[PDB]
Amino acid sequence: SMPDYVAKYPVIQTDDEREAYKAVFQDQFSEYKELSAEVQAVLRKFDELDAVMHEEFKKKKNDPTFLEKKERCDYLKNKLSHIKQRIQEYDKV
């Protein structure tokens, strides 16, 4: 098994497909930007705490909610990257 975007975003063949992938990239990038910034901020907040040096903060780091948030963020970086790769390949042609 592979991520869902692999199947949903096959090799571009038409100019319309290229524009559709662009629309999807623009939408998902704004979502990704926001999410990643938030995730990094938290990770950094702890980074500042680490520099200062607690247990509650370690738990916060392993919070399942945030942990889930971090995994969605990784999915998004991967999805966007794949779509970008697709567009570029067509663009080179």
Swiss-Prot record:
OCEL domain boundaries: 3-93
Compartment(s): Cell membrane; Cell junction, Tight junction
Coiled coil: 2-92
Residues annotated as signal peptide: none
Post-translational note: Ubiquitinated by ITCH; but this ubiquitination does not lead to proteasomal degradation. Phosphorylated.
Domain of life: Eukaryota
Function, in words: Plays a role in the formation of tricellular tight junctions and of epithelial barriers. Required for normal hearing via its role in the separation of the endolymphatic and perilymphatic spaces of the organ of Corti in the inner ear, and for normal survival of hair cells in the organ of Corti.
Subunit structure, interactors included: Interacts with TJP1. Interacts with the ubiquitin ligase ITCH. Interacts (via C-terminal cytoplasmic domain) with LSR (via the cytoplasmic domain), ILDR1 and ILDR2; the interaction is required to recruit MARVELD2 to tricellular contacts.
Disease involvement: Deafness, autosomal recessive, 49: A form of non-syndromic sensorineural hearing loss. Sensorineural deafness results from damage to the neural receptors of the inner ear, the nerve pathways to the brain, or the area of the brain that receives sound information.
Protein family (similarity comment): Belongs to the ELL/occludin family.
Record's protein name: MARVEL domain-containing protein 2
